[PDB]
Coordinates of C-alpha atoms and ligand atoms in Angstrom, one line a residue:
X4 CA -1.8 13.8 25.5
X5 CA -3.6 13.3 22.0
X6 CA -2.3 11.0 19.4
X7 CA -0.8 11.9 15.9
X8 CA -0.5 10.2 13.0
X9 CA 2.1 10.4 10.7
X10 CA 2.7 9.4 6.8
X11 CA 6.9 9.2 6.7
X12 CA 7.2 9.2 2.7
X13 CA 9.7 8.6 0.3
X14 CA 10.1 12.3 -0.5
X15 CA 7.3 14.2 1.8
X16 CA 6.1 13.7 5.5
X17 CA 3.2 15.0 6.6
X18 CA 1.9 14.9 10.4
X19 CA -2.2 15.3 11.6
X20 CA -4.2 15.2 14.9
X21 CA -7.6 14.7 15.6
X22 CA -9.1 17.4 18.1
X23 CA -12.2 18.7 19.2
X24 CA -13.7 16.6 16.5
X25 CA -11.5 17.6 13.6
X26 CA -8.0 16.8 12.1
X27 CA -5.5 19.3 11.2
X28 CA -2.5 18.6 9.6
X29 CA 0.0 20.8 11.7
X30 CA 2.1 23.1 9.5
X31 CA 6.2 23.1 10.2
X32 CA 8.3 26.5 11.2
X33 CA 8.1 28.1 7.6
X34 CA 4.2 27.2 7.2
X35 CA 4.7 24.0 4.9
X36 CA 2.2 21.4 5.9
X37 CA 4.3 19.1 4.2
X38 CA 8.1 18.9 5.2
X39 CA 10.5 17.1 2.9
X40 CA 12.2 14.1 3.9
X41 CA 15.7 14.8 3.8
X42 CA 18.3 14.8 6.4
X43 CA 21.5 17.3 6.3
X44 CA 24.9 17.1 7.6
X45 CA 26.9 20.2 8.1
X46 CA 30.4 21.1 9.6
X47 CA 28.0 22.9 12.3
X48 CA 24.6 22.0 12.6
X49 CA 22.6 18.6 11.4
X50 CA 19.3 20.1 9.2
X51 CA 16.2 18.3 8.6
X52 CA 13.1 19.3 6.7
X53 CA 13.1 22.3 4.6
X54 CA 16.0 23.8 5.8
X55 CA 17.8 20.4 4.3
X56 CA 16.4 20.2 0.7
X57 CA 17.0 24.0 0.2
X58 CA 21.2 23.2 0.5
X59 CA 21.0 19.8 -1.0
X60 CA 23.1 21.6 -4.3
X61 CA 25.6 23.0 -1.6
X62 CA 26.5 19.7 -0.3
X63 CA 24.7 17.1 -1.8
X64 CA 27.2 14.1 -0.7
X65 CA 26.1 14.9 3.0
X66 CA 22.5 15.4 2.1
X67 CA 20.3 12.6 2.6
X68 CA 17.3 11.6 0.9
X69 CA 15.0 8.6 -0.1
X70 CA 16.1 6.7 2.7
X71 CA 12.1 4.6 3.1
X72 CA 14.1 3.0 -0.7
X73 CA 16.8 1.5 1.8
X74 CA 14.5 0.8 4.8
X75 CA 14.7 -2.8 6.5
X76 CA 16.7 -3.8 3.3
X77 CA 20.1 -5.4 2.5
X78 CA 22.8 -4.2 0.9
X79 CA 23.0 -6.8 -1.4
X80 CA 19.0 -6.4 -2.7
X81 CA 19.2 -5.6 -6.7
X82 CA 16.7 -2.7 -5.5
X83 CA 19.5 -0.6 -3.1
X84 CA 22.4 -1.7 -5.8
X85 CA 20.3 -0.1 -8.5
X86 CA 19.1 2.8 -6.9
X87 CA 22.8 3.6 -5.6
X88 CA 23.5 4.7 -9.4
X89 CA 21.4 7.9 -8.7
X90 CA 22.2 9.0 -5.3
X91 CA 24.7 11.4 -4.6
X92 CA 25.6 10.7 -0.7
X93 CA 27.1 7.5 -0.1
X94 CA 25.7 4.1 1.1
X95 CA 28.5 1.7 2.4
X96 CA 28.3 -2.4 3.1
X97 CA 28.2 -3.3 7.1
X98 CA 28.0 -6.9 7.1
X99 CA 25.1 -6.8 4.7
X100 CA 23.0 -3.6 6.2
X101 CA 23.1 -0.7 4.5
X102 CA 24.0 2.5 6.3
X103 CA 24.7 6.0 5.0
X104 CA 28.2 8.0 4.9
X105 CA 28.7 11.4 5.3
X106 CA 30.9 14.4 7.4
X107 CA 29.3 15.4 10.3
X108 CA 31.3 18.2 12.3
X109 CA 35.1 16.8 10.7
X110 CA 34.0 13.2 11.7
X111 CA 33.4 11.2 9.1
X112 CA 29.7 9.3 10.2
X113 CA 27.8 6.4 9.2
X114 CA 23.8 6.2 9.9
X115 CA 21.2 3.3 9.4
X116 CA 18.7 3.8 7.6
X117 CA 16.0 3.9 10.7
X118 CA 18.3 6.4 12.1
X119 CA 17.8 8.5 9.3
X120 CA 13.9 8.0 9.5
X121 CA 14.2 8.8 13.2
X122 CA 15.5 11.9 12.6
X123 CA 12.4 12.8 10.0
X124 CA 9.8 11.7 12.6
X125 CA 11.7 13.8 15.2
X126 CA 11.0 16.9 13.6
X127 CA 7.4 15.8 12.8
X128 CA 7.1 15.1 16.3
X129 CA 8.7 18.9 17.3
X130 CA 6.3 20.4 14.5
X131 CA 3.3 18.7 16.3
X132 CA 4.4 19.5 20.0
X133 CA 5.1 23.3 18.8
X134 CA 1.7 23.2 17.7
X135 CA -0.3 21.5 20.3
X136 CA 1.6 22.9 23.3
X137 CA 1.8 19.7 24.7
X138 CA 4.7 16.9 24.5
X139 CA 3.4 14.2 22.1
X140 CA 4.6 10.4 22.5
X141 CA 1.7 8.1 21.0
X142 CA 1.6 7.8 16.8
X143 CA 0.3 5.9 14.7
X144 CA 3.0 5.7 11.9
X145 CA 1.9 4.3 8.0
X146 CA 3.8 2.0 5.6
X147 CA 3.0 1.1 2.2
X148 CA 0.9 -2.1 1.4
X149 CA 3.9 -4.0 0.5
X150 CA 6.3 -3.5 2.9
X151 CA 7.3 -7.1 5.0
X152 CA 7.5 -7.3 8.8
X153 CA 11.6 -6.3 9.0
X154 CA 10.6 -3.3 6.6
X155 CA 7.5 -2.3 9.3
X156 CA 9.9 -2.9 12.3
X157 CA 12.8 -0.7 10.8
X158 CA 9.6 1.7 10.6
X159 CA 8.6 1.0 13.9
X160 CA 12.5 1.3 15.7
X161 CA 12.9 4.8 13.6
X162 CA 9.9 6.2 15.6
X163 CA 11.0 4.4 19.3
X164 CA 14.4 6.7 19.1
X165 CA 12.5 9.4 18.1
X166 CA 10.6 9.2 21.7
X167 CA 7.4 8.2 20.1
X168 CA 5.6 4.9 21.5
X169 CA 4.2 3.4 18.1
X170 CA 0.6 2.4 18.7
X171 CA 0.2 0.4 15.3
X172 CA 1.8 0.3 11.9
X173 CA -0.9 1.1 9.3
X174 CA -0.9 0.4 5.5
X175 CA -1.0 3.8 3.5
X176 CA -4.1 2.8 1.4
X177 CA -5.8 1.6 4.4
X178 CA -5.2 5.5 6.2
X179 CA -6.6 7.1 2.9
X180 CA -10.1 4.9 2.8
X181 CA -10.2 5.3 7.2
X182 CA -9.8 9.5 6.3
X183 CA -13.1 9.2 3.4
X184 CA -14.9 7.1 6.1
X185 CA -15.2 3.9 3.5
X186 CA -15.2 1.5 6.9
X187 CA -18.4 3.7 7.9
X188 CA -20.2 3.1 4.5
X189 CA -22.8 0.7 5.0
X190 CA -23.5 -3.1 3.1
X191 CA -21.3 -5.6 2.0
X192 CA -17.3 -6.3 1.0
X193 CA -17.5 -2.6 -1.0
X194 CA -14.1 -3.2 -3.0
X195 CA -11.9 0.2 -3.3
X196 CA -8.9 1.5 -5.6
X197 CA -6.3 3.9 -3.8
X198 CA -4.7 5.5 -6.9
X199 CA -1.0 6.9 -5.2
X200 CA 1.1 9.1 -7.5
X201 CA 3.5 10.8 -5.5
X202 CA 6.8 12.8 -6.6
X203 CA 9.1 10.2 -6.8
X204 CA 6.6 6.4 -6.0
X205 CA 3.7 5.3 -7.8
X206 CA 1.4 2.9 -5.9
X207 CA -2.2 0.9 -6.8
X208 CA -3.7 -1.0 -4.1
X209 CA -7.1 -2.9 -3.9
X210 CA -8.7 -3.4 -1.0
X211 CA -12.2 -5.3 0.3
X212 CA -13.9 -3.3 3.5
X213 CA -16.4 -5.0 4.8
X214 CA -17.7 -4.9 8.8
X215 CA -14.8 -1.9 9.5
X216 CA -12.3 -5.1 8.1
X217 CA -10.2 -3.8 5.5
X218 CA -8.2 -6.3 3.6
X219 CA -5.4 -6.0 0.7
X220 CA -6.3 -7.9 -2.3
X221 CA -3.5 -6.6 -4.8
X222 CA -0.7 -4.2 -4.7
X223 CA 1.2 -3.0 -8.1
X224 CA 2.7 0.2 -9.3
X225 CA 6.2 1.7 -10.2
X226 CA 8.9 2.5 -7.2
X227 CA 10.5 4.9 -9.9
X228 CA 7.6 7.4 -11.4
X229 CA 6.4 10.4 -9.7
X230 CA 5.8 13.8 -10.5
X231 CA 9.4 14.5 -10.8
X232 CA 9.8 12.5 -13.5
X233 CA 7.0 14.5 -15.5
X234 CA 9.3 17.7 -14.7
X235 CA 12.5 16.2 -15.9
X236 CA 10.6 15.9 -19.4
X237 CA 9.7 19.3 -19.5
X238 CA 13.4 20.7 -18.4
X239 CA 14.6 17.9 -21.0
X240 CA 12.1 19.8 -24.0
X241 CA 13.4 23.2 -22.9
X242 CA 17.1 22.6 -22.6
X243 CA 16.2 21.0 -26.5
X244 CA 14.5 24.3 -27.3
X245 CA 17.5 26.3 -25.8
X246 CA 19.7 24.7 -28.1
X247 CA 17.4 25.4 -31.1
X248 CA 16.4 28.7 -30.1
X249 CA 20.1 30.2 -28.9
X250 CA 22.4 26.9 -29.8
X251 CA 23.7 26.5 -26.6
X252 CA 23.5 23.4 -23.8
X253 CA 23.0 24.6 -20.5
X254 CA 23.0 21.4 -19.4
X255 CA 27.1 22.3 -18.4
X256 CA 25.7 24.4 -16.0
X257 CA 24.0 23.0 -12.9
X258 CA 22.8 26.6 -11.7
X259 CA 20.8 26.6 -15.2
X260 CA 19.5 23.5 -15.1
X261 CA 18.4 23.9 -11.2
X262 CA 16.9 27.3 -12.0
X263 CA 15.4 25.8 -14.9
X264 CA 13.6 22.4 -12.6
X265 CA 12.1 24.8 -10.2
X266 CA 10.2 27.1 -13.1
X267 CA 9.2 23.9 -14.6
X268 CA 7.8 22.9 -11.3
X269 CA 6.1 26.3 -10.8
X270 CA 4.4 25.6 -14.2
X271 CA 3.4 22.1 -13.9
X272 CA 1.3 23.4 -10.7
X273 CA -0.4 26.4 -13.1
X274 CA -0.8 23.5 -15.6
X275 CA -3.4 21.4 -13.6
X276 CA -5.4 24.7 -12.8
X277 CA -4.9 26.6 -16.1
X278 CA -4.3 25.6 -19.9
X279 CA -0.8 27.1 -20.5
X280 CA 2.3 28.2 -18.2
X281 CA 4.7 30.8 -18.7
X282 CA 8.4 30.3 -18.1
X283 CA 10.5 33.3 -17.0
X284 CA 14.2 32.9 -16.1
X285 CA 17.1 36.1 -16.4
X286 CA 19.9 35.1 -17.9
X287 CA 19.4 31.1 -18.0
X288 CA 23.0 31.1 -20.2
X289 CA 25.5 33.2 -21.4
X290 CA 23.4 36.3 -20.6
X291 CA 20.1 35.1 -22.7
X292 CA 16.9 35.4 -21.2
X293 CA 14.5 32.9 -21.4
X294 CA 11.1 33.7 -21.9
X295 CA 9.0 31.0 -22.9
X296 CA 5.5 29.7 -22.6
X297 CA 4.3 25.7 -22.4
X298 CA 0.8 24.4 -22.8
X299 CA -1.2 21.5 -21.0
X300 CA -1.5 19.6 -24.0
X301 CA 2.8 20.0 -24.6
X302 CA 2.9 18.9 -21.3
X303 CA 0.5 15.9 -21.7
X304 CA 2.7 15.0 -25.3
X305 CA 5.3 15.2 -23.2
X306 CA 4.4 12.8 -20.1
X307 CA 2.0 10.9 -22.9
X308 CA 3.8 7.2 -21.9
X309 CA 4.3 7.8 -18.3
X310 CA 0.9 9.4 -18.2
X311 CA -0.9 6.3 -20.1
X312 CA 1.3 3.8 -18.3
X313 CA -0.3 4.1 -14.5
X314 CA -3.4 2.1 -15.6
X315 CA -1.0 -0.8 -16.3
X316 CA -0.7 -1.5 -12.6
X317 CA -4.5 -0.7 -12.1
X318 CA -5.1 -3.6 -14.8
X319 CA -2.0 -5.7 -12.8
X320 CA -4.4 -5.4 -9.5
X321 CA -7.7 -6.0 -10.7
X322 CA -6.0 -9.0 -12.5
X323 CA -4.3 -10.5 -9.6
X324 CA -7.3 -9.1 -7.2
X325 CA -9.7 -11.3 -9.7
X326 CA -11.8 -8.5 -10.0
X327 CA -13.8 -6.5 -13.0
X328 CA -13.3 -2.9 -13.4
X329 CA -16.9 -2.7 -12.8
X330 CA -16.6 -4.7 -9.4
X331 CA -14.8 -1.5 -8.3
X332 CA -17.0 0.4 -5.3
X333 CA -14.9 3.2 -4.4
X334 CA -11.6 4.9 -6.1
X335 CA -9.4 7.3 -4.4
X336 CA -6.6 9.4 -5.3
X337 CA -3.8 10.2 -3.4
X338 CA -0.7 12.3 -3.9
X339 CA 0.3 15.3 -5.2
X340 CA 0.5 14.5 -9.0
X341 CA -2.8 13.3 -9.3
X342 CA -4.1 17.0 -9.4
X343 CA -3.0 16.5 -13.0
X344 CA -6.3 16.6 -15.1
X345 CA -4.9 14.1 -17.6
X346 CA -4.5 11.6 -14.6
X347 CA -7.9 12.0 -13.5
X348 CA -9.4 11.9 -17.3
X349 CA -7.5 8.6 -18.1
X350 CA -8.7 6.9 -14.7
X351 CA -11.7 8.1 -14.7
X352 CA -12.6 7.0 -19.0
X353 CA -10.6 3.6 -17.9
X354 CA -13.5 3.4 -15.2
X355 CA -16.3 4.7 -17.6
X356 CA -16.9 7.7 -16.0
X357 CA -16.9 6.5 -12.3
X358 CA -16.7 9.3 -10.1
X359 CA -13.4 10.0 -8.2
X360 CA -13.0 10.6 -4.5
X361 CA -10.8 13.4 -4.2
X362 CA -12.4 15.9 -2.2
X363 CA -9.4 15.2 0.8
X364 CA -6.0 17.2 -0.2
X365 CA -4.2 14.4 -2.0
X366 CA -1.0 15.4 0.2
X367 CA -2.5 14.8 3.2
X368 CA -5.1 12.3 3.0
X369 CA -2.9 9.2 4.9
X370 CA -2.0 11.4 7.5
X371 CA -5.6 12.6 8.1
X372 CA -6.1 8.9 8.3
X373 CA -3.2 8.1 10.4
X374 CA -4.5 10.5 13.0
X375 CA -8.4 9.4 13.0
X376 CA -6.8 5.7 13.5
X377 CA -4.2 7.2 16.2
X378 CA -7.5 9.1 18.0
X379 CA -9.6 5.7 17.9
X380 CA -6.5 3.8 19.7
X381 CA -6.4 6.5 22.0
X382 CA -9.0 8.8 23.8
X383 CA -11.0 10.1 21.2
X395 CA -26.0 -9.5 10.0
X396 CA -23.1 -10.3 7.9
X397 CA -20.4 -13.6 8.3
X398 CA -16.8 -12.9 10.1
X399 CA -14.7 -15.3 8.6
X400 CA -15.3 -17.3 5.6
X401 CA -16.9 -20.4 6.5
X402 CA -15.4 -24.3 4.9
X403 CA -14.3 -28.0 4.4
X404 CA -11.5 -29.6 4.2
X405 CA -10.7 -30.8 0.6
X406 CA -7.9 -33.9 -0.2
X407 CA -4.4 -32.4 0.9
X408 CA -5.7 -30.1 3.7
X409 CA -7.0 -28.0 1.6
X410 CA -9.7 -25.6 2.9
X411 CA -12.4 -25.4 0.6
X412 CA -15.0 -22.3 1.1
X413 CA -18.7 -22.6 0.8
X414 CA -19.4 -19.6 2.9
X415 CA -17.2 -16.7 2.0
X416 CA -16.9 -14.1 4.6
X417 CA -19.2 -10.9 4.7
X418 CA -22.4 -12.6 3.1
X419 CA -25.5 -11.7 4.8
X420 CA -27.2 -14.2 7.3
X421 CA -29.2 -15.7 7.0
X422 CA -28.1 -17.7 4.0
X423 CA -28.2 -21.8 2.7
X424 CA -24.7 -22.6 0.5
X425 CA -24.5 -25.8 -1.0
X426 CA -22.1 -27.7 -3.2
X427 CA -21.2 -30.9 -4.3
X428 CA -18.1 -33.4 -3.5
X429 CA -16.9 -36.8 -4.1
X430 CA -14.3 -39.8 -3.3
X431 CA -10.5 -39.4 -3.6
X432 CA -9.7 -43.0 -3.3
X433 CA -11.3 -46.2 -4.9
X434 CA -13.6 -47.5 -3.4
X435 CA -14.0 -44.8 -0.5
X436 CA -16.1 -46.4 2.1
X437 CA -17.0 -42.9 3.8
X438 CA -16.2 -39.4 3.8
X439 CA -15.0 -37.3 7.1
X440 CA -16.8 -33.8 6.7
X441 CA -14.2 -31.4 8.7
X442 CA -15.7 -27.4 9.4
X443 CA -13.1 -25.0 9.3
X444 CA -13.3 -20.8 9.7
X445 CA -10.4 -19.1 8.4
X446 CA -8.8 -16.9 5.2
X447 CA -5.9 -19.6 4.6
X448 CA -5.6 -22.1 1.7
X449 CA -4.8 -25.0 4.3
X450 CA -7.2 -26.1 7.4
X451 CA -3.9 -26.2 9.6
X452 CA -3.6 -22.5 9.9
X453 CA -7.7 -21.9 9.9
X454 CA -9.7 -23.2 13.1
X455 CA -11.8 -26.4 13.5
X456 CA -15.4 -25.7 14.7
X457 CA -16.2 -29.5 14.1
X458 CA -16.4 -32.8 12.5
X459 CA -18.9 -35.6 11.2
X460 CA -18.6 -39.0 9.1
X461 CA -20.8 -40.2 6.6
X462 CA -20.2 -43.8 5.7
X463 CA -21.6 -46.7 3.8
X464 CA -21.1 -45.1 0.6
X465 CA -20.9 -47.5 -2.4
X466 CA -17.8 -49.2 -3.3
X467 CA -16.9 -47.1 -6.4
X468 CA -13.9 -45.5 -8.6
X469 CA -12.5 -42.1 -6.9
X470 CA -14.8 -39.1 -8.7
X471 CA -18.1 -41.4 -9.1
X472 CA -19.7 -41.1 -5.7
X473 CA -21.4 -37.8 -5.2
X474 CA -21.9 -36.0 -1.3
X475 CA -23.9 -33.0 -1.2
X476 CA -22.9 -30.6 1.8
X477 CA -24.9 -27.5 3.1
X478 CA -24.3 -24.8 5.2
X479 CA -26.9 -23.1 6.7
X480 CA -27.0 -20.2 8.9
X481 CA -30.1 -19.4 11.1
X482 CA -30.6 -15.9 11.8
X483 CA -29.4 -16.1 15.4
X484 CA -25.7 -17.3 13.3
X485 CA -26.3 -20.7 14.2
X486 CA -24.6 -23.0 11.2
X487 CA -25.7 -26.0 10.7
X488 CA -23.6 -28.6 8.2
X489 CA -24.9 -31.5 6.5
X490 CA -23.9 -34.4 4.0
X491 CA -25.7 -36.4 2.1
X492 CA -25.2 -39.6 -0.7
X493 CA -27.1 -38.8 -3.6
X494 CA -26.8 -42.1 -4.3
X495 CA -28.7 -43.2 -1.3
X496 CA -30.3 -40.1 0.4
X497 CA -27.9 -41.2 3.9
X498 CA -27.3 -38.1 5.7
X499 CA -25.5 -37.0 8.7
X500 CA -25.4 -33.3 10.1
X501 CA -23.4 -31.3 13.0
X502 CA -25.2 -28.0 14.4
X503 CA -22.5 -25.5 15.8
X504 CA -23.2 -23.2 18.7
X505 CA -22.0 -19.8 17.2
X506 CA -20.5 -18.7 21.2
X507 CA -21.2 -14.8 21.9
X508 CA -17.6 -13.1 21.9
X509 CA -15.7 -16.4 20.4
X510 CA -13.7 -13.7 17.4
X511 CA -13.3 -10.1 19.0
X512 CA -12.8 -7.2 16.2
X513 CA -8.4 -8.1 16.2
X514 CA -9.4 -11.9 15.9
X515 CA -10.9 -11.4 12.2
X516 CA -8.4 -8.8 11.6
X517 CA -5.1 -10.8 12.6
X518 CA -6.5 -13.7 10.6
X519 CA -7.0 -11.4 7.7
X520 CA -3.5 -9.5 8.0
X521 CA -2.5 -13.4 8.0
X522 CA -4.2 -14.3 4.5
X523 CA -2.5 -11.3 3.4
X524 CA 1.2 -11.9 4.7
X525 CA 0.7 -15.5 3.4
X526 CA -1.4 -15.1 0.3
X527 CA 1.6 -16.0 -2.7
X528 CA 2.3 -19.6 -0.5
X529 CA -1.0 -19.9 0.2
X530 CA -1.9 -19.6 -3.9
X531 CA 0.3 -22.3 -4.9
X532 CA -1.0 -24.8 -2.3
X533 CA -4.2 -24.1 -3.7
X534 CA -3.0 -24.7 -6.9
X535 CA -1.0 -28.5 -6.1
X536 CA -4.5 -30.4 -5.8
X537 CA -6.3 -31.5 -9.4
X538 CA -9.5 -32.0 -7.7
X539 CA -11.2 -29.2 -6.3
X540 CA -14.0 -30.8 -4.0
X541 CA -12.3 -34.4 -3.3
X542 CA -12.9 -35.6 0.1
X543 CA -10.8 -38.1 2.3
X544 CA -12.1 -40.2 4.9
X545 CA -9.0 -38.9 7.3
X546 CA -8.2 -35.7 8.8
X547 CA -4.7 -34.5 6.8
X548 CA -3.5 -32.3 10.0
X549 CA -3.5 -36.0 12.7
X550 CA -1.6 -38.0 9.6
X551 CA 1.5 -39.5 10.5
X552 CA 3.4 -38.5 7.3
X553 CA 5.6 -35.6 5.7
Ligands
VLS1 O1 5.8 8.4 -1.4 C1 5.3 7.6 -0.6 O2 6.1 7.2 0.3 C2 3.8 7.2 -0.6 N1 3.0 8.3 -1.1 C3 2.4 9.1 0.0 C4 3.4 10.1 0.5 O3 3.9 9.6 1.7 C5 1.9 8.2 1.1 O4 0.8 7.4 0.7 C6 1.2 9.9 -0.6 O5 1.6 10.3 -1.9
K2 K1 3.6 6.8 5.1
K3 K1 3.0 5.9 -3.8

């Protein structure tokens, strides 16, 4: 049958398939087409969804929640001991892993964390075979940007005991650009900003799309701000203004205080469409009524730090993306809380008035994308890699970087590492990696009779030039005495299929902190040996 793809969030999951040449995202059994990620334990029955966040008050020690926190983790990580503080169910030590405690049926029972995740995409899975009539195994299941490989197989095993066969593990960002078509756009390396606020994660990722490619420059963001955090500042103000108004702390009463979160919720919602919200609870405390109203502007003096904050981590990932604001092609916004108009003002004035793509429900835009990428695995002239030498150390040094139109003539200039350098050895590499052992050798040449001179005085100019047909052609030559020598490569038909580029980009990615510092050990940038590093004998 048809694919689906699914986003398993923090605190939402949301489930979509593409058919008859439209995605839907399915609704679950009380018409939500979001269902919350929380897991319930019961003397009786095991709830998930809904039905579990509606009697999390009720038993909150056997209610489980924000188990993508815990997710291919370890016990010992400062992150699980930290968030531990806030979590009312129990997480317990097995030999390092963290599972979950609570009483199931007068058995006391421990889960992993995948379990619990298998148990979320099981009902996304029910949700979608309920809706489609059909039993559904193939799903394409998303991850955020930053997650390592134990994190995306933890995702992965959660989905196999669910019954579903996981096609691919997508990033998050990556599903939100596939779902606004960004890959279809046409040109050259168009560089996009996902902008993730969701209830309880906020996430910033850069990413370069160029031939259908997409690759992850930066990541940054806060694991700890979300919408819900904007809420707890409104029920903090009213529980103040109770205590003015009435001098009385309901804050001794958790009924009050819950009764009080959902009416602030309920008005933060009315807030993003309208300018004020009114709050109307019976007999909050001790018999008093509150009536009350809040406007937007309270609200934005209210969340005014948190608010401001989220463009630190969009100036964190142009920074470590090397990028300008105005270098910025596409920006999209995903989540819930960015509905909020101050969100959208701030991003949008930090971008001088760069239009925002939001036109996707911000809920539901990675698993729209999850579900055109699950259709695409399913039924349903520009440069591949960046093109370079070798440099002293093994260091692969770009003169070609990848997606530049062809045809096109780079040159740059190089010179001796060692005194007296009787040649140099001009090595062609393709490849995303600091160092020419993980990028691929197309070929090599020698240039020799150079000068006897001190290391940096002899000058070698190299070109690259690339015929339209994509035929490169490399040359050297002394300035000092015109000499040159030059290799034509035959650019085969077929050589680097579509996964080739992309598994050598995913590489660059996995790799890219190492790969930085390497860059970083040589002084000279364009120093050339007469040896190839990768045959030496040594270290
Ligand atoms: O909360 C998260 O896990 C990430 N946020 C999304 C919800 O899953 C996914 O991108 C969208 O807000
Ligand atoms: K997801
Ligand atoms: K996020």
């Amino acid at each position: 049958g048809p694919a689906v793809g699914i986003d398993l969030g923090t605190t939402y999951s949301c489930v979509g398939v593409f058919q008859h040449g439209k995605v839907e995202i399915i609704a679950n059994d009380q018409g939500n087409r979001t269902t919350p990620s929380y897991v319930a334990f019961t003397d009786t029955e095991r709830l998930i969804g809904d039905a579990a966040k509606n009697q999390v008050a009720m038993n909150p020690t056997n209610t489980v929640f924000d188990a993508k926190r815990l997710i291919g983790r370890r016990f010992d990580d400062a992150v699980v001991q930290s968030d531990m503080k806030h979590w009312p169910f129990m997480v317990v030590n097995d030999a390092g892993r963290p599972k979950v405690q609570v009483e199931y049926k007068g058995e006391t029972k421990s889960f992993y964390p995948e379990e619990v995740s298998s148990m979320v995409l099981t009902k996304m899975k029910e949700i979608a075979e309920a809706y489609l009539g059909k039993t559904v195994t193939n799903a394409v299941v998303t991850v955020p940007a930053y997650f390592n490989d134990s994190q995306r197989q933890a995702t992965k095993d959660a989905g196999t005991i669910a019954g579903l066969n996981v096609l691919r593990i997508i990033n998050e960002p990556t599903a939100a650009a596939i779902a606004y078509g960004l890959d279809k756009k046409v040109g050259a390396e168009r560089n996009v900003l996902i902008f993730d606020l969701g209830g309880g994660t906020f996430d910033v990722s850069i990413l370069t799309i160029a031939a259908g490619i997409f690759e992850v420059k930066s990541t940054a963001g806060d694991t700890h701000l979300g919408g819900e955090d904007f809420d707890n500042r409104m029920v903090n103000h009213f529980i103040a203004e109770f205590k003015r108004k009435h001098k009385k702390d309901i804050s001794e009463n958790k009924r009050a205080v819950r009764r009080l979160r959902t009416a602030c919720e309920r008005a933060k919602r009315t807030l993003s469409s309208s300018t004020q919200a009114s709050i109307e609870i019976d007999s909050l405390y001790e018999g008093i009524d509150f009536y009350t109203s809040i406007t937007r502007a309270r609200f934005e003096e209210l969340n005014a730090d948190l608010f401001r904050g989220t463009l630190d981590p969009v100036e964190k990932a142009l920074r470590d993306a090397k990028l300008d604001k105005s270098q910025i092609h596409d920006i999209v916004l995903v989540g819930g809380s960015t509905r909020i108009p101050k969100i959208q003002k701030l991003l949008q004035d930090f971008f001088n008035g760069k239009e925002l793509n939001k036109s996707i429900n911000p809920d539901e835009a990675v698993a729209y994308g999850a579900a055109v990428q699950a259709a695409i695995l399913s039924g349903d002239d520009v440069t591949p890699l960046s093109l370079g030498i070798e440099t002293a150390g093994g260091v692969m040094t770009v003169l070609i970087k990848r997606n530049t139109t062809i045809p096109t003539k780079q040159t740059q200039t190089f010179t001796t590492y060692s005194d007296n350098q009787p040649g140099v050895l001009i090595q062609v590499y393709e490849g995303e990696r600091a160092m020419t052992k993980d990028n691929n050798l197309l070929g090599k040449f020698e240039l020799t009779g150079i000068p006897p001179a001190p290391r940096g005085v002899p000058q070698i100019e190299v070109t690259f030039d690339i015929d339209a047909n994509g035929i490169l052609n490399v040359s050297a030559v002394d300035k000092s005495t015109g000499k040159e020598n030059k290799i034509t490569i035959t650019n085969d038909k077929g050589r680097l299929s579509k996964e080739d580029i992309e598994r050598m980009v995913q590489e660059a990615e996995k790799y890219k902190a190492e790969d930085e510092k390497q860059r970083d050990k040589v002084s000279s940038k364009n120093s050339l040996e007469s040896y190839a590093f990768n045959m030496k004998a040594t270290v």
